[PDB]
Amino acid sequence: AVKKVGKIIKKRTKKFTRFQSNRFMRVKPAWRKPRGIDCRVRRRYKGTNLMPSIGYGSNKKTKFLLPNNKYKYVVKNKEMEPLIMNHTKYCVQIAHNVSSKKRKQIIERAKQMNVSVINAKARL
Amino acid sequence: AAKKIKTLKLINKKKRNDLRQRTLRYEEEYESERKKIIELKREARKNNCFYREAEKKVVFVIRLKGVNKLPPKVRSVFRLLRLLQVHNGVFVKVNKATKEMLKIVEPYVTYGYPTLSTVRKLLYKRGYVRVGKVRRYARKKIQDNADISKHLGKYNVHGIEDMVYQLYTCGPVFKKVNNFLWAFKLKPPRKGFKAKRHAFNEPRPGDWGNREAHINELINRMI
Amino acid sequence: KQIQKKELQKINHDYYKGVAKAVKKKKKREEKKAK
Amino acid sequence: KSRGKRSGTRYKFSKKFRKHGECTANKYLEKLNYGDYVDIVCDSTQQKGMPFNYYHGKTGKIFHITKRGVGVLVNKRVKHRIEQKKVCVRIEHVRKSRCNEDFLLRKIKNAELIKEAKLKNEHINIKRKTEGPKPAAMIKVPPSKIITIEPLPFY
Amino acid sequence: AKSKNHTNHNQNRKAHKNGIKKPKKHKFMSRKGLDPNFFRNQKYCLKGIQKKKKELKLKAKQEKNN
Amino acid sequence: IDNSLNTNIHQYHIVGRAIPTAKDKNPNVYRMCIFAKNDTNAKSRFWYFMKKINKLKKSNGELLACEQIKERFPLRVKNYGVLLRYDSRTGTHNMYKEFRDTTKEGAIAQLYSEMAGRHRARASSINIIRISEISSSLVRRPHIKQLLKRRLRFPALHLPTLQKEYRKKFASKRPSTYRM
RNA sequence: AUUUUAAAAUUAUUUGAAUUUUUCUUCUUAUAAUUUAAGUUGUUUCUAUACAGUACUUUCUUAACCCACUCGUCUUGAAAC
RNA sequence: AUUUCACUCAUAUUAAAUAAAAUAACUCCAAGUGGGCCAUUUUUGGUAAGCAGAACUGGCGAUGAGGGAUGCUCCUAACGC
């Protein structure tokens, strides 16, 4: 069912799973388009692992923005200069390969910059 | 550089007043026709003579079946007459040649004489207009008179009641108005058809064929 | 509307009279063809 | 298994009843011009200079004239396309057409009418009428001629 | 193995899928080998008229170019 | 008046004529009254009868008059004798029947139901002819003879048919079809 | 941010006239706003007076009505005995 | 027969009607294909066949959705969410 929250209108959840990935371990949950001949999914039988298509794509007016109504952006060491102007539009996430000292300085600068952080409590 | 705005305003006012006079004459014509037909039939019954009114010269037609499983000639005639969907509807002039080509599409269509109220309702309610440049029309609802005057006003039919008259009476302008007016998209009936698979004139209940004066009733649920 | 009503009575009366004459003629022809 | 020249003309090429004997001694005297429209009719009294199986009944135009030969250009269908074909036939078989006498008469009428129409400065619907809806009028019939109809019995 | 010896099914639909193609109908038709001893004269006719027209053209060109 | 109760048959009167031709200057105008659902079916059936009896069709002919014949008195009791022409699965017959009701419309509807019930003769396989009112004396079928006795009366053995408002799924105790 | 303007209608003035002959009668001269114009705006609560909970969003497991024949393959024809 | 001049033949609805008629026309490069089948109607051989073989058209294959309990082809109808 479509989920409606504020202004972001999402049309689908339950990230799609590969056909037959239930009773076959070697088939991983990552989706693929089965080619086959009589492969059911291609025929689109009534109610059996319906496949992704273009129609499920959300609205580009709101597409990439996160429930924070704010696009996310990665940071590594000190790259906060391009964030000063658009503090109402871009949230910042620390890269997972950042040590505690650098992450501490980044969180210090960001908090006074007044920009939200996603993984604030990382490795501490 | 500012006189143009006021000049356009007087142009609009002149167009409005002229359209007023046009629709008054049209309303005169309709009541005149009704009075004439009533008095002629009364005179016919008074004397020993009979009076028959000619066919209405304009026919509204609707497609009934889908797209698959059709004869190639049938599909070609549909594409030539602009009946593409399964509930599209169009007006056609009445000529012996036109009726002859309609004869080879009768089983899949329903065609009849318009009557005035329902053609007015169709124009106001479900009417849509090709607006843009040739072959790039970009169908758009009427909602106004600017575009109709822009493209069709050349022949001095700018307005909406002008279209109403030019349609209900077989007048000078069809190949322009009918080409201008997008095919009507019709809603399914309020109650439903009788039998898509049997003719109307058959004693068994059925629908396809010639309905003449009856088509207005089914249009009133088509809308 | 009485004049029109009289006229309508007359015309429908003539229609039914013609139909009745047709009935009688067909009956007489059947009687002839009987023997 | 057999697809010879005159295959399957047991009746088509056969001369019609009581029409045997040589071609009419006046068919030679017709006048032909380049650009005229012509019909091809296969006669059988003449043998040489003969059309072929398919071309009987078709039309075309004159583009080649010899002492006795006439070359006509025809559109013959083949599967996905139409390709011009030039056929050389003889005067006995060839025959002046009527496919354009209607249009020629129409042009002559136009020339002899719209001249005076323009002289008077009148506009007419010179396009062909294609009579469709009749007008509405009043007619008379006495009650002494109305003959009823009724379905018939069985026998 | 028995093999179907012929069919003509679907041929018309294949033909009309691309539409029945028409010949281009160009204006002039070549006279490579049509009824000579007439176009033999016609070529001399064209050469003569062209010669007269072009010599008058050159005469006018010279009398206007001094 | 209830639409469910009433049928959909109206007597129609049609007059037509072939287009006047050079070969025959004035053709004999035809006129005929038929039963049908509505005017369009009336015209179609009229032209079909034309095509079957007289040498004439739509293209080389046209209409003159198309009117509706309605009853003089809708609440009288009459008797109607109607001749027919129908075709069985193996042959074609004609027969003459009687009916008693208010109007010719109801008589024709009753006749059509009678044919469908008694001979499985579908609607398109029927032809009506020479329907006419008849006297009480000259009726030819005893099952309508006995209806016109001097003073009729009989019981009401018909079972009850109550509304959907009260056709409940449970009750207090067994009712009785005896009633009165 | 240079058509959410024009007029379109409504009210309240005024202008001349009209006619179906007047409290939704109509046509504008000039004025100021309303919106039926020119895509839903307002009011009262609750969340809630808290920093993680039974509320709220989400993952997972269970059940429930409906549907769903092992895939890949050559084949006119595959779930195939 | 040709060339150049005269003159002018509806063209403002357009030498009949109607046309989502220029989604055209052409040229070049290239894959797959080259065992078919079913259905109304016509029809050849055989007694007949869910047979063998053709014909105008539509489907199936290449395609699911609702119905015929159920079905590769039947009826409605062809699929973005």
PDB file of C-alpha atoms in Angstrom, chain B:
ATOM      1  CA  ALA B   1       3.229  50.878 -26.695  1.00  0.00           C
ATOM      2  CA  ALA B   2       0.160  50.884 -24.443  1.00  0.00           C
ATOM      3  CA  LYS B   3      -2.623  51.692 -26.932  1.00  0.00           C
ATOM      4  CA  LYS B   4      -2.614  48.016 -27.951  1.00  0.00           C
ATOM      5  CA  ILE B   5      -4.144  46.857 -24.655  1.00  0.00           C
ATOM      6  CA  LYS B   6      -7.130  49.205 -24.915  1.00  0.00           C
ATOM      7  CA  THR B   7      -7.549  48.455 -28.620  1.00  0.00           C
ATOM      8  CA  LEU B   8      -7.682  44.749 -27.797  1.00  0.00           C
ATOM      9  CA  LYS B   9     -10.262  45.501 -25.109  1.00  0.00           C
ATOM     10  CA  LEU B  10     -12.539  47.260 -27.603  1.00  0.00           C
ATOM     11  CA  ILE B  11     -11.964  44.372 -30.015  1.00  0.00           C
ATOM     12  CA  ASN B  12     -13.127  41.952 -27.317  1.00  0.00           C
ATOM     13  CA  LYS B  13     -16.187  44.092 -26.585  1.00  0.00           C
ATOM     14  CA  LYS B  14     -17.122  44.226 -30.273  1.00  0.00           C
ATOM     15  CA  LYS B  15     -16.750  40.453 -30.546  1.00  0.00           C
ATOM     16  CA  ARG B  16     -18.940  40.013 -27.462  1.00  0.00           C
ATOM     17  CA  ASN B  17     -21.729  42.203 -28.829  1.00  0.00           C
ATOM     18  CA  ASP B  18     -21.614  40.577 -32.262  1.00  0.00           C
ATOM     19  CA  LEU B  19     -21.823  37.134 -30.644  1.00  0.00           C
ATOM     20  CA  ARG B  20     -24.797  38.391 -28.629  1.00  0.00           C
ATOM     21  CA  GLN B  21     -26.640  39.326 -31.808  1.00  0.00           C
ATOM     22  CA  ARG B  22     -25.637  36.039 -33.458  1.00  0.00           C
ATOM     23  CA  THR B  23     -27.032  33.921 -30.635  1.00  0.00           C
ATOM     24  CA  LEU B  24     -30.239  35.971 -30.601  1.00  0.00           C
ATOM     25  CA  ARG B  25     -30.747  35.237 -34.302  1.00  0.00           C
ATOM     26  CA  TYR B  26     -29.987  31.560 -33.684  1.00  0.00           C
ATOM     27  CA  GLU B  27     -32.571  31.371 -30.895  1.00  0.00           C
ATOM     28  CA  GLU B  28     -35.016  32.986 -33.313  1.00  0.00           C
ATOM     29  CA  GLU B  29     -34.239  30.327 -35.924  1.00  0.00           C
ATOM     30  CA  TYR B  30     -34.797  27.363 -33.593  1.00  0.00           C
ATOM     31  CA  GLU B  31     -38.255  28.482 -32.457  1.00  0.00           C
ATOM     32  CA  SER B  32     -39.135  29.409 -36.041  1.00  0.00           C
ATOM     33  CA  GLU B  33     -38.281  25.872 -37.160  1.00  0.00           C
ATOM     34  CA  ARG B  34     -40.361  24.295 -34.397  1.00  0.00           C
ATOM     35  CA  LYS B  35     -43.370  26.486 -35.195  1.00  0.00           C
ATOM     36  CA  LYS B  36     -43.061  25.735 -38.914  1.00  0.00           C
ATOM     37  CA  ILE B  37     -42.910  21.970 -38.442  1.00  0.00           C
ATOM     38  CA  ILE B  38     -45.890  21.977 -36.066  1.00  0.00           C
ATOM     39  CA  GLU B  39     -48.058  24.095 -38.363  1.00  0.00           C
ATOM     40  CA  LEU B  40     -47.087  22.103 -41.457  1.00  0.00           C
ATOM     41  CA  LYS B  41     -48.023  18.808 -39.814  1.00  0.00           C
ATOM     42  CA  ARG B  42     -51.312  20.305 -38.618  1.00  0.00           C
ATOM     43  CA  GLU B  43     -52.112  21.529 -42.138  1.00  0.00           C
ATOM     44  CA  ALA B  44     -51.236  18.107 -43.546  1.00  0.00           C
ATOM     45  CA  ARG B  45     -53.666  16.428 -41.162  1.00  0.00           C
ATOM     46  CA  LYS B  46     -56.305  19.078 -41.912  1.00  0.00           C
ATOM     47  CA  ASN B  47     -56.205  18.339 -45.636  1.00  0.00           C
ATOM     48  CA  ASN B  48     -55.855  15.012 -47.477  1.00  0.00           C
ATOM     49  CA  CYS B  49     -52.101  15.300 -47.913  1.00  0.00           C
ATOM     50  CA  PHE B  50     -49.060  14.000 -46.075  1.00  0.00           C
ATOM     51  CA  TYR B  51     -45.944  15.772 -44.821  1.00  0.00           C
ATOM     52  CA  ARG B  52     -42.553  14.163 -44.246  1.00  0.00           C
ATOM     53  CA  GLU B  53     -39.516  15.916 -42.805  1.00  0.00           C
ATOM     54  CA  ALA B  54     -36.161  15.281 -44.444  1.00  0.00           C
ATOM     55  CA  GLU B  55     -33.392  13.504 -42.570  1.00  0.00           C
ATOM     56  CA  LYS B  56     -31.529  15.723 -40.138  1.00  0.00           C
ATOM     57  CA  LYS B  57     -28.347  15.717 -42.280  1.00  0.00           C
ATOM     58  CA  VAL B  58     -26.111  15.348 -39.207  1.00  0.00           C
ATOM     59  CA  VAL B  59     -25.576  12.080 -37.355  1.00  0.00           C
ATOM     60  CA  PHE B  60     -23.887  11.417 -34.033  1.00  0.00           C
ATOM     61  CA  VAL B  61     -22.160   8.041 -33.926  1.00  0.00           C
ATOM     62  CA  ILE B  62     -20.485   5.986 -31.197  1.00  0.00           C
ATOM     63  CA  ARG B  63     -18.214   2.943 -31.458  1.00  0.00           C
ATOM     64  CA  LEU B  64     -19.215  -0.144 -29.479  1.00  0.00           C
ATOM     65  CA  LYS B  65     -16.647  -2.967 -29.721  1.00  0.00           C
ATOM     66  CA  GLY B  66     -12.951  -3.037 -28.882  1.00  0.00           C
ATOM     67  CA  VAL B  67      -9.911  -3.009 -31.132  1.00  0.00           C
ATOM     68  CA  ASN B  68      -8.969  -6.674 -31.610  1.00  0.00           C
ATOM     69  CA  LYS B  69     -10.618  -9.033 -34.101  1.00  0.00           C
ATOM     70  CA  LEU B  70     -11.860  -6.682 -36.807  1.00  0.00           C
ATOM     71  CA  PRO B  71     -11.858  -6.900 -40.610  1.00  0.00           C
ATOM     72  CA  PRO B  72      -9.120  -4.794 -42.229  1.00  0.00           C
ATOM     73  CA  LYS B  73     -11.682  -2.776 -44.178  1.00  0.00           C
ATOM     74  CA  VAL B  74     -13.614  -2.150 -40.960  1.00  0.00           C
ATOM     75  CA  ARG B  75     -10.489  -0.967 -39.151  1.00  0.00           C
ATOM     76  CA  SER B  76      -9.519   1.271 -42.069  1.00  0.00           C
ATOM     77  CA  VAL B  77     -12.966   2.878 -42.094  1.00  0.00           C
ATOM     78  CA  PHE B  78     -12.782   3.395 -38.329  1.00  0.00           C
ATOM     79  CA  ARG B  79      -9.388   5.079 -38.639  1.00  0.00           C
ATOM     80  CA  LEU B  80     -10.706   7.221 -41.500  1.00  0.00           C
ATOM     81  CA  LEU B  81     -13.813   8.250 -39.531  1.00  0.00           C
ATOM     82  CA  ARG B  82     -11.815   8.917 -36.337  1.00  0.00           C
ATOM     83  CA  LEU B  83     -13.336   6.349 -33.944  1.00  0.00           C
ATOM     84  CA  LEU B  84     -10.243   5.172 -32.127  1.00  0.00           C
ATOM     85  CA  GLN B  85     -11.283   4.275 -28.575  1.00  0.00           C
ATOM     86  CA  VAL B  86     -14.248   2.080 -27.628  1.00  0.00           C
ATOM     87  CA  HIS B  87     -16.376   4.980 -26.382  1.00  0.00           C
ATOM     88  CA  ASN B  88     -15.389   7.731 -28.758  1.00  0.00           C
ATOM     89  CA  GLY B  89     -18.117   9.644 -30.536  1.00  0.00           C
ATOM     90  CA  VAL B  90     -18.213  11.956 -33.555  1.00  0.00           C
ATOM     91  CA  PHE B  91     -20.581  13.905 -35.773  1.00  0.00           C
ATOM     92  CA  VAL B  92     -20.814  13.128 -39.483  1.00  0.00           C
ATOM     93  CA  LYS B  93     -22.488  14.887 -42.382  1.00  0.00           C
ATOM     94  CA  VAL B  94     -25.188  12.882 -44.154  1.00  0.00           C
ATOM     95  CA  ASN B  95     -24.475  12.067 -47.784  1.00  0.00           C
ATOM     96  CA  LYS B  96     -25.298   8.952 -49.775  1.00  0.00           C
ATOM     97  CA  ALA B  97     -21.589   8.120 -50.060  1.00  0.00           C
ATOM     98  CA  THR B  98     -21.018   8.698 -46.341  1.00  0.00           C
ATOM     99  CA  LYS B  99     -24.016   6.526 -45.473  1.00  0.00           C
ATOM    100  CA  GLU B 100     -22.744   3.860 -47.864  1.00  0.00           C
ATOM    101  CA  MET B 101     -19.391   3.709 -46.093  1.00  0.00           C
ATOM    102  CA  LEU B 102     -21.233   3.700 -42.765  1.00  0.00           C
ATOM    103  CA  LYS B 103     -23.127   0.666 -44.087  1.00  0.00           C
ATOM    104  CA  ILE B 104     -19.937  -1.413 -43.854  1.00  0.00           C
ATOM    105  CA  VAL B 105     -19.430  -0.363 -40.228  1.00  0.00           C
ATOM    106  CA  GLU B 106     -23.036  -0.562 -38.974  1.00  0.00           C
ATOM    107  CA  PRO B 107     -22.521  -3.732 -36.848  1.00  0.00           C
ATOM    108  CA  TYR B 108     -19.973  -2.021 -34.567  1.00  0.00           C
ATOM    109  CA  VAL B 109     -21.498   1.460 -34.200  1.00  0.00           C
ATOM    110  CA  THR B 110     -24.613   3.275 -33.002  1.00  0.00           C
ATOM    111  CA  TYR B 111     -25.660   6.336 -34.992  1.00  0.00           C
ATOM    112  CA  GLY B 112     -28.624   8.690 -34.903  1.00  0.00           C
ATOM    113  CA  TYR B 113     -30.157  12.176 -35.196  1.00  0.00           C
ATOM    114  CA  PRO B 114     -28.754  14.603 -32.617  1.00  0.00           C
ATOM    115  CA  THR B 115     -31.518  16.874 -31.234  1.00  0.00           C
ATOM    116  CA  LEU B 116     -30.510  20.245 -29.822  1.00  0.00           C
ATOM    117  CA  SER B 117     -30.333  19.954 -26.033  1.00  0.00           C
ATOM    118  CA  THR B 118     -27.999  16.977 -26.079  1.00  0.00           C
ATOM    119  CA  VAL B 119     -25.651  18.507 -28.657  1.00  0.00           C
ATOM    120  CA  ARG B 120     -25.493  21.632 -26.499  1.00  0.00           C
ATOM    121  CA  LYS B 121     -24.751  19.468 -23.450  1.00  0.00           C
ATOM    122  CA  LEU B 122     -22.039  17.577 -25.327  1.00  0.00           C
ATOM    123  CA  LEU B 123     -20.403  20.800 -26.489  1.00  0.00           C
ATOM    124  CA  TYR B 124     -20.436  22.383 -23.029  1.00  0.00           C
ATOM    125  CA  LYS B 125     -19.657  19.323 -20.889  1.00  0.00           C
ATOM    126  CA  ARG B 126     -17.466  16.803 -22.741  1.00  0.00           C
ATOM    127  CA  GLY B 127     -16.226  19.133 -25.480  1.00  0.00           C
ATOM    128  CA  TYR B 128     -12.509  19.334 -26.172  1.00  0.00           C
ATOM    129  CA  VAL B 129     -10.577  21.377 -28.695  1.00  0.00           C
ATOM    130  CA  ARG B 130      -7.429  20.952 -30.746  1.00  0.00           C
ATOM    131  CA  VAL B 131      -5.482  24.119 -29.983  1.00  0.00           C
ATOM    132  CA  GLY B 132      -1.878  24.161 -31.158  1.00  0.00           C
ATOM    133  CA  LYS B 133      -0.150  23.969 -34.509  1.00  0.00           C
ATOM    134  CA  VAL B 134      -1.137  21.536 -37.258  1.00  0.00           C
ATOM    135  CA  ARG B 135      -0.349  17.871 -36.501  1.00  0.00           C
ATOM    136  CA  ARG B 136       0.655  19.005 -32.980  1.00  0.00           C
ATOM    137  CA  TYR B 137      -2.787  19.862 -31.691  1.00  0.00           C
ATOM    138  CA  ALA B 138      -2.377  18.988 -27.978  1.00  0.00           C
ATOM    139  CA  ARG B 139      -6.067  18.551 -27.121  1.00  0.00           C
ATOM    140  CA  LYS B 140      -7.399  21.077 -24.616  1.00  0.00           C
ATOM    141  CA  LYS B 141     -10.808  21.841 -23.130  1.00  0.00           C
ATOM    142  CA  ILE B 142     -12.630  24.927 -24.374  1.00  0.00           C
ATOM    143  CA  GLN B 143     -13.149  27.014 -21.199  1.00  0.00           C
ATOM    144  CA  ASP B 144     -12.950  30.199 -23.293  1.00  0.00           C
ATOM    145  CA  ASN B 145     -13.297  31.684 -26.779  1.00  0.00           C
ATOM    146  CA  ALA B 146      -9.783  33.013 -27.445  1.00  0.00           C
ATOM    147  CA  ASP B 147      -8.383  29.928 -29.184  1.00  0.00           C
ATOM    148  CA  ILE B 148     -11.587  29.259 -31.125  1.00  0.00           C
ATOM    149  CA  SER B 149     -11.466  32.814 -32.454  1.00  0.00           C
ATOM    150  CA  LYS B 150      -7.719  32.463 -33.080  1.00  0.00           C
ATOM    151  CA  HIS B 151      -7.939  29.430 -35.345  1.00  0.00           C
ATOM    152  CA  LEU B 152     -11.582  29.221 -36.456  1.00  0.00           C
ATOM    153  CA  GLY B 153     -12.747  32.844 -36.186  1.00  0.00           C
ATOM    154  CA  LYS B 154     -11.515  33.512 -39.729  1.00  0.00           C
ATOM    155  CA  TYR B 155     -14.768  32.119 -41.124  1.00  0.00           C
ATOM    156  CA  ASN B 156     -16.697  34.359 -38.693  1.00  0.00           C
ATOM    157  CA  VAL B 157     -17.878  31.541 -36.428  1.00  0.00           C
ATOM    158  CA  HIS B 158     -15.954  32.748 -33.382  1.00  0.00           C
ATOM    159  CA  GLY B 159     -17.806  31.824 -30.202  1.00  0.00           C
ATOM    160  CA  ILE B 160     -19.619  28.775 -28.820  1.00  0.00           C
ATOM    161  CA  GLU B 161     -23.265  29.206 -29.779  1.00  0.00           C
ATOM    162  CA  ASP B 162     -21.961  29.739 -33.298  1.00  0.00           C
ATOM    163  CA  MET B 163     -20.611  26.186 -33.092  1.00  0.00           C
ATOM    164  CA  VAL B 164     -23.930  25.020 -31.640  1.00  0.00           C
ATOM    165  CA  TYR B 165     -25.856  26.401 -34.619  1.00  0.00           C
ATOM    166  CA  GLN B 166     -23.261  25.369 -37.197  1.00  0.00           C
ATOM    167  CA  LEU B 167     -23.589  21.815 -35.874  1.00  0.00           C
ATOM    168  CA  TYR B 168     -27.332  21.452 -35.293  1.00  0.00           C
ATOM    169  CA  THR B 169     -28.019  22.861 -38.770  1.00  0.00           C
ATOM    170  CA  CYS B 170     -26.063  21.527 -41.728  1.00  0.00           C
ATOM    171  CA  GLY B 171     -24.387  24.794 -42.619  1.00  0.00           C
ATOM    172  CA  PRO B 172     -21.347  26.036 -44.510  1.00  0.00           C
ATOM    173  CA  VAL B 173     -18.750  24.839 -42.005  1.00  0.00           C
ATOM    174  CA  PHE B 174     -18.174  21.170 -41.231  1.00  0.00           C
ATOM    175  CA  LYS B 175     -14.736  20.222 -42.513  1.00  0.00           C
ATOM    176  CA  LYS B 176     -13.376  22.938 -40.204  1.00  0.00           C
ATOM    177  CA  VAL B 177     -15.507  22.472 -37.074  1.00  0.00           C
ATOM    178  CA  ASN B 178     -15.419  18.669 -37.051  1.00  0.00           C
ATOM    179  CA  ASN B 179     -11.682  18.634 -37.745  1.00  0.00           C
ATOM    180  CA  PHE B 180     -11.234  21.194 -34.952  1.00  0.00           C
ATOM    181  CA  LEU B 181     -13.341  19.338 -32.393  1.00  0.00           C
ATOM    182  CA  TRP B 182     -11.598  16.395 -30.732  1.00  0.00           C
ATOM    183  CA  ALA B 183     -13.458  13.090 -30.660  1.00  0.00           C
ATOM    184  CA  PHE B 184     -15.860  13.011 -27.726  1.00  0.00           C
ATOM    185  CA  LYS B 185     -14.837  10.688 -24.894  1.00  0.00           C
ATOM    186  CA  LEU B 186     -17.986   9.138 -23.431  1.00  0.00           C
ATOM    187  CA  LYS B 187     -18.679   7.608 -20.025  1.00  0.00           C
ATOM    188  CA  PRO B 188     -20.361   4.175 -19.900  1.00  0.00           C
ATOM    189  CA  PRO B 189     -24.151   4.270 -19.484  1.00  0.00           C
ATOM    190  CA  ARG B 190     -25.851   5.027 -16.197  1.00  0.00           C
ATOM    191  CA  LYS B 191     -27.799   1.752 -16.461  1.00  0.00           C
ATOM    192  CA  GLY B 192     -26.091  -0.138 -19.294  1.00  0.00           C
ATOM    193  CA  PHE B 193     -26.567  -1.341 -22.836  1.00  0.00           C
ATOM    194  CA  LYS B 194     -29.166  -3.927 -23.842  1.00  0.00           C
ATOM    195  CA  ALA B 195     -27.115  -6.382 -25.917  1.00  0.00           C
ATOM    196  CA  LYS B 196     -23.876  -5.460 -27.687  1.00  0.00           C
ATOM    197  CA  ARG B 197     -24.200  -8.689 -29.669  1.00  0.00           C
ATOM    198  CA  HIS B 198     -27.633  -8.140 -31.266  1.00  0.00           C
ATOM    199  CA  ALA B 199     -29.068  -5.498 -33.562  1.00  0.00           C
ATOM    200  CA  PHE B 200     -31.449  -2.846 -32.282  1.00  0.00           C
ATOM    201  CA  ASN B 201     -34.120  -3.369 -34.935  1.00  0.00           C
ATOM    202  CA  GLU B 202     -34.129  -7.092 -34.180  1.00  0.00           C
ATOM    203  CA  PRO B 203     -37.197  -8.106 -32.142  1.00  0.00           C
ATOM    204  CA  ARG B 204     -34.747  -9.632 -29.683  1.00  0.00           C
ATOM    205  CA  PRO B 205     -33.198  -6.992 -27.405  1.00  0.00           C
ATOM    206  CA  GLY B 206     -30.071  -5.553 -28.988  1.00  0.00           C
ATOM    207  CA  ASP B 207     -28.330  -2.311 -29.650  1.00  0.00           C
ATOM    208  CA  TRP B 208     -26.129  -2.004 -32.737  1.00  0.00           C
ATOM    209  CA  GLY B 209     -27.591  -0.316 -35.790  1.00  0.00           C
ATOM    210  CA  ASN B 210     -29.758   2.696 -36.615  1.00  0.00           C
ATOM    211  CA  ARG B 211     -31.458   4.399 -33.671  1.00  0.00           C
ATOM    212  CA  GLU B 212     -32.579   7.660 -35.357  1.00  0.00           C
ATOM    213  CA  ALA B 213     -34.391   9.841 -32.813  1.00  0.00           C
ATOM    214  CA  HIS B 214     -33.642   7.546 -29.864  1.00  0.00           C
ATOM    215  CA  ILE B 215     -29.900   8.250 -29.607  1.00  0.00           C
ATOM    216  CA  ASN B 216     -30.446  11.295 -27.382  1.00  0.00           C
ATOM    217  CA  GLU B 217     -31.751   9.162 -24.509  1.00  0.00           C
ATOM    218  CA  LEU B 218     -28.661   6.958 -24.495  1.00  0.00           C
ATOM    219  CA  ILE B 219     -26.415  10.013 -24.855  1.00  0.00           C
ATOM    220  CA  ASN B 220     -28.023  11.453 -21.718  1.00  0.00           C
ATOM    221  CA  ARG B 221     -26.497   8.484 -19.879  1.00  0.00           C
ATOM    222  CA  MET B 222     -23.350   8.466 -22.024  1.00  0.00           C
ATOM    223  CA  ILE B 223     -22.421  11.889 -20.639  1.00  0.00           C
TER     224      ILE B 223
END
